[PDB]
Chain length 576, copies 2
Amino acid sequence: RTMTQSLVTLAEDNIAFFSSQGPGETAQRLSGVFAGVREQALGLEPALGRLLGVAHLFDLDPETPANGYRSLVHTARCCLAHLLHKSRYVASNRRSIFFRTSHNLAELEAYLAALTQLRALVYYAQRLLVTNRPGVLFFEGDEGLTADFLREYVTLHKGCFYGRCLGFQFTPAIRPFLQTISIGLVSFGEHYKRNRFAIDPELRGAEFERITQNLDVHFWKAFWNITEMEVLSSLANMASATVRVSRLLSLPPEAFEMPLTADPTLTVTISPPLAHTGPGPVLVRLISYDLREGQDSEELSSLIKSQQAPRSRSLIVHFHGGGFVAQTSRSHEPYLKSWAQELGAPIISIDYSLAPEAPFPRALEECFFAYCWAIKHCALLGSTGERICLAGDSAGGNLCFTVALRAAAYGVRVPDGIMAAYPATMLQPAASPSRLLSLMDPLLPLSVLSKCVSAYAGAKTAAFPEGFHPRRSSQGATQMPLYSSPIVKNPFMSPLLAPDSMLKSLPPVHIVACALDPMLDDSVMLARRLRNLGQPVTLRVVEDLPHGFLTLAALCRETRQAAELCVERIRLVLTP
Amino acid sequence: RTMTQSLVTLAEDNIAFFSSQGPGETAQRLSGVFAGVREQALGLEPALGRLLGVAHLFDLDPETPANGYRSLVHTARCCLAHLLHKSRYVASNRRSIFFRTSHNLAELEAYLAALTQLRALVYYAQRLLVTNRPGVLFFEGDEGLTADFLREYVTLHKGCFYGRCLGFQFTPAIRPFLQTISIGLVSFGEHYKRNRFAIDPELRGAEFERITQNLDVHFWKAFWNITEMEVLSSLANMASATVRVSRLLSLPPEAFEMPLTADPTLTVTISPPLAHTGPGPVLVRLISYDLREGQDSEELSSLIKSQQAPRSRSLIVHFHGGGFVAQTSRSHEPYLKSWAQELGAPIISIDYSLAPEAPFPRALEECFFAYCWAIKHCALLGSTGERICLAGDSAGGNLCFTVALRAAAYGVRVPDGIMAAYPATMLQPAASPSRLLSLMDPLLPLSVLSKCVSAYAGAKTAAFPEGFHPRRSSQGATQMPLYSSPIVKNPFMSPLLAPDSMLKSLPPVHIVACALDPMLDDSVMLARRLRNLGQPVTLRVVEDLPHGFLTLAALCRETRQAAELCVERIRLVLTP
């Protein structure tokens, strides 16, 4: 309340400060800009108040302020505080007209656009809040009305977050990296459309919002694995710790023997990953700190595709992230090598196959085969197998859940821990308050996750009160195929809306996320759907960071303490 | 002897191990490879012994073993130690033929080529030493026969230091960056010729050694200021420290007046810097940690081109480097900001004009004008002028001798100390034992600095015993115009061959250098020409690093303390 009035009480004087000392256009521009600033603050105060009150009404626990409503309120108050600081500075420094009016004119115009767009988004979040039943942050409606809701929200235009104001909601110590990532991605988009703009940030939005609705997942397939090509994969490894064992493996494409815990004398044989195209080489790769006992012999030396540490205690499995479409296992070492420094475990970072050329169930069976091969060939991997741990990543968190839960349907000993960081656990398309901030994020537009589930599932190719009208996206109405066949509503693909009776045997789960991800409301529903069953799950939320910070640890101080947050919670699995 | 004999005692068995266990071509290949290795070591040992004896005979002081002879001896010794370690590993691990013979065949033939080419270079060093008078590091001959020596050097072929073994003489932690850098040059060269190479290192030399002799100075005008563009400068600026004063200036192109310290009552006026094309704006930019007293007023704020810190004690001048053709003042920030953390002085990183469109004296008097303007407008720069400390780089290391001593010709007071990191003080073209290893350096070959003096000067466009026939460069004779008109004989281009009576009034000098630079023999020659006059000059040498590492401070674990060494000797000036 004191933040909103402070912009209003400095309005008329600053309107009178510039309108009385010049008849030019800039006096009218600045007076109208500051009148719009006070009007937007005063009109945005009560909707923010209702949002924060029901956000208190909405969260699962008081310890973790993790909802979409808190994130939208945080974005709005960050914009308001930035406008307040800029206003205080210009008010304290308006003795001369030494500063050019054009620069601050364009800055405050962009911030006017930011405040009016956040006003539209906060009104839409309030509409969703009224429409749904409180207590559930998702929607129970059918496909048609959910698609109508998603199209109605995505009709808005994003000319402010993608221009000069890219990254106001984050730490100021990270913004130049976001700007050069934007420049590089626009550069690849222009180069590949053809098969400068970095000086002027005003024209950055004029392509950064067109790539939101004019992008293909085959084209983002290059983006996650741009850290794979032989110059940057080599140039990203000086921050990586010391190592010796960085060898690939090649598993045989034939089934073997494995027992079940319900009766040790009875075993169950399960076929290799066929997916009606023929089993192939399950390509895994072992990353270990040193050569372990019984590991550097011929049984491991015979499977590489073209002193000794003692008997190990517990191997750590790993599935990479990268949207199930890119970022193979050759990219996650610079924190995987830093993982092995203190854990002391042979980290087999499985490179599972990637969508859409290898969708489910191929993408979920060879990591089911590699996990199955690693309880019996334990000495071949330099491990014992009396205790198993797990790891998860950006997209490989649902795959971290699914392969650790369908094993319980087979009777084989499941692991006793899950460490999935910001997982994509809600691949079923539905509107959500935290998925509303998917059109504004720096690294990914709303179309990253819209076309991620098209690749995985193998798909075949009043609204507003009168007088309120911000800029609207008139660049063609995007009508994409987002149909939900019965192969998408399942734990095996999205383990929330799974039947309740088969989530009881889940391992203990440790999960982290950030407050400003689209993968925030998805992870929040996980805690609510398991705290009513007695199973313990711990969700930790961080702030001022995007999603995709695990491959970005050696960049800033706040990304250091967030990507290291995965490490100390992954070793709680290791104790008996 | 024991390092060379130990390569011989495991030769006959190594031949008997492979030639008696297979009739294929690889047996003859490996036997010939190890015979060539043993004969190259045994024939290169006596030349190395003569070179080390005369290297002990030739250096100035025992404290700093810095010549060309020590550097060539170290290169040969490092190649021999690498081959010895590889032979030890292969001899200990030749129980099976599991390792592919082709890979070690290619590595060992590359090392055979390396030993042959280093043998040719060591023979060239011996012939040079012999020919010239002992005691003088440089040659006293005329232009014609020195050009004959240079061409008789150039006709050699360097197909070994630029292939897979690119960067053996340095630390292994630095080599991946050199590999990506080499990929950068080969991609730049093929793109610039036209207006993949990371998989096969054998084909890397076949383009790199053509790039060496087929590049232009305008081509190299982009490499050093590739960190000047806004995306890479922004991507490098987070490692720098915090700042608030990073403002450019714009000096008036009109003459003004100085006193003389010989007699304060008499006065002298500057002739404005014309270079027969008209005086312009002396672009100088100020870097300071905080706003200082009398600095943020209207006088400084009226010069930007389109609490308060107290009365400062002294300023620090800075001239950038970059071969006089690139690397302007907009590329030296990320370590210049760390300079202001402890020094407590305002850095004026002067952006002087750049060769070849602005040769001497245009590149000489603008920085003379900027230094002259800072003696009088001291408070306007937030200084007092009670002490001048001066800094230098690869190319700016002669600026702290040329314009820092020509002020004493004008009678005005001179700075009380010079810091010059690896200065280029012998721009007159002639060969030396440290200019010998200018064809093997990764980041710049010999045709970089030999063609950067045509830019600065504004130029107008038995040999071997019988049976010794290594690979020779038959790709055209590079008969470039390297004529030396008397404009390079003068003191104000290369101060070693200056008249003796004027270097007496030089300020005290502190110079750092590396043991593997082409600009090594010149920097040790500088201490020779001043230690016989009584003026104290200190020279520090480092190892395992190239020259050009000041912009590469925060990239390796060994360049961190080497670029910190420049700061350590730059604060010794500040004491009275």
